[PDB]
Design an enzyme around this catalytic site. Structure first.
Site, PDB file in Angstrom:
ATOM      1  N   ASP A  39       0.852  -1.185   0.000  1.00 38.53           N
ATOM      2  CA  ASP A  39       0.000   0.000   0.000  1.00 38.53           C
ATOM      3  C   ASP A  39       0.894   1.242   0.000  1.00 38.53           C
ATOM      4  O   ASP A  39       1.968   1.232  -0.608  1.00 38.53           O
ATOM      5  CB  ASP A  39      -0.978  -0.095   1.189  1.00 38.53           C
ATOM      6  CG  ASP A  39      -2.221   0.731   0.988  1.00 38.53           C
ATOM      7  OD1 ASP A  39      -3.317   0.140   0.899  1.00 38.53           O
ATOM      8  OD2 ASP A  39      -2.108   1.971   0.930  1.00 38.53           O
ATOM      9  N   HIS A  69      -3.533   5.797   3.950  1.00 33.70           N
ATOM     10  CA  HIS A  69      -4.316   4.665   3.469  1.00 33.70           C
ATOM     11  C   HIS A  69      -3.697   3.344   3.910  1.00 33.70           C
ATOM     12  O   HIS A  69      -4.382   2.481   4.471  1.00 33.70           O
ATOM     13  CB  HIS A  69      -4.423   4.743   1.946  1.00 33.70           C
ATOM     14  CG  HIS A  69      -5.331   3.718   1.344  1.00 33.70           C
ATOM     15  ND1 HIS A  69      -4.873   2.513   0.857  1.00 33.70           N
ATOM     16  CD2 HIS A  69      -6.669   3.724   1.138  1.00 33.70           C
ATOM     17  CE1 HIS A  69      -5.891   1.819   0.381  1.00 33.70           C
ATOM     18  NE2 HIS A  69      -6.992   2.531   0.539  1.00 33.70           N
ATOM     19  N   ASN A 161     -13.879  -0.061  -6.169  1.00 36.49           N
ATOM     20  CA  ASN A 161     -14.946   0.816  -5.700  1.00 36.49           C
ATOM     21  C   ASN A 161     -15.702   1.463  -6.856  1.00 36.49           C
ATOM     22  O   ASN A 161     -16.106   2.625  -6.780  1.00 36.49           O
ATOM     23  CB  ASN A 161     -14.381   1.898  -4.784  1.00 36.49           C
ATOM     24  CG  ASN A 161     -13.662   1.325  -3.584  1.00 36.49           C
ATOM     25  OD1 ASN A 161     -13.862   0.167  -3.221  1.00 36.49           O
ATOM     26  ND2 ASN A 161     -12.808   2.133  -2.965  1.00 36.49           N
ATOM     27  N   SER A 224     -10.949  -1.255  -0.132  1.00 38.32           N
ATOM     28  CA  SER A 224      -9.642  -1.233   0.509  1.00 38.32           C
ATOM     29  C   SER A 224      -9.749  -1.500   2.003  1.00 38.32           C
ATOM     30  O   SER A 224      -8.783  -1.960   2.619  1.00 38.32           O
ATOM     31  CB  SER A 224      -8.984   0.127   0.279  1.00 38.32           C
ATOM     32  OG  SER A 224      -8.529   0.256  -1.056  1.00 38.32           O
TER      33      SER A 224
END
Ligand code: CA
Ligand code: CA
Length: 279
Positions: A39, A69, A161, A224
């Site tokens: 990530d 994130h 998403n 996520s």
């Protein structure tokens, strides 16, 4: 073990029904397992990781998570308060820049890195990789995720998403990995969650409280956020010896809450990650 007033996602994965508040889990808590969070990096100094997190690789100038994130996803995997596997070891691989973006060549390299780096770590209960990222379909990205899974790592990837079929997104569309959709506290498919035949499992993804950079916390939404729930659950179950890296996704689907979700299009699994914990 029982964590009262836990984030709804943790309570959901330890319940057959929505709306509970306690996260019930075995005290082993993923001890002995390892989860690579591929990530934006991990703020390993966050007290919530209790020294169990460390950066092992960065593809940028610094290993610091300048976005949050990756720290959020890592927290859902194995932070004390917000993590599924509260005693797992977290390894940060920074393939995404501080804006949350990353070239596919770098994301591929990060996957290949984990496949090799795991051979240098003590992870007796197994290795998991949480890939809370993705873009358009790419056979090379899918092949990298397939390689990482084939190397013996339980790969969990976000479905995306886009409120669309995950077949058009990678590594979500790689069949051999665990493609994770997102649900909300009311057992609806998250309004943004991708769907389709390639999804293996759903996890809590809407309004997920976890760690954030600056030693902080915040609640954000996305596939996520559902992915680390499944990655942490895999580590948790692998520590319990109930499954292996190669079979963890199939086991999670086999033992998931079945038919609890709404707004699931026909052809998409109606399976919600569930740890089947029995006190
Ligand atoms: Ca149920
Ligand atoms: Ca799959």
């Amino acid at each position: 073990a029982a964590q009262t007033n836990a984030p709804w996602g943790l309570a959901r994965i330890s319940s057959t029904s929505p709306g509970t508040s306690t996260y019930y889990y075995d005290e082993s808590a993923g001890q002995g397992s390892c989860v690579y969070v591929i990530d934006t990096g991990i703020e390993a100094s966050h007290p919530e990781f209790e020294g169990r997190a460390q950066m092992v690789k960065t593809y940028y100038y610094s290993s610091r998570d300048g976005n949050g994130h990756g720290t959020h996803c890592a927290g859902t995997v194995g932070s004390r308060t917000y993590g599924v596997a509260k005693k797992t070891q977290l390894f940060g691989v920074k393939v995404l820049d501080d804006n949350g973006s990353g070239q596919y060549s770098t994301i591929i390299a990060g996957m290949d890195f984990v496949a090799s780096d795991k051979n240098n770590r003590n992870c007796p209960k197994g290795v998991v990789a949480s890939l809370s990222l993705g873009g358009g379909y790419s056979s090379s990205v899918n092949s990298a995720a397939a390689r990482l899974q084939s190397s013996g790592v339980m790969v969990a990837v976000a479905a995306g998403n886009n409120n669309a079929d995950a077949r058009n997104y990678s590594p979500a569309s790689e069949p051999s990995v665990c493609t994770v959709g997102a649900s909300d506290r009311y057992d609806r498919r998250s309004s943004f969650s991708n769907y389709g035949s390639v999804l293996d499992i759903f996890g809590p993804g809407t309004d997920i409280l976890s760690t954030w950079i600056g030693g902080s916390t915040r609640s954000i939404s996305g596939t996520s956020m559902a992915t680390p729930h499944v990655a942490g659950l895999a580590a948790y179950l692998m520590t319990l010896g109930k499954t292996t890296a190669a079979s963890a996704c199939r086991y999670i689907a086999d033992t998931a809450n079945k038919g609890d979700l709404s707004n699931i299009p026909f052809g998409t699994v109606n399976l919600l990650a569930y740890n089947n914990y029995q006190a």
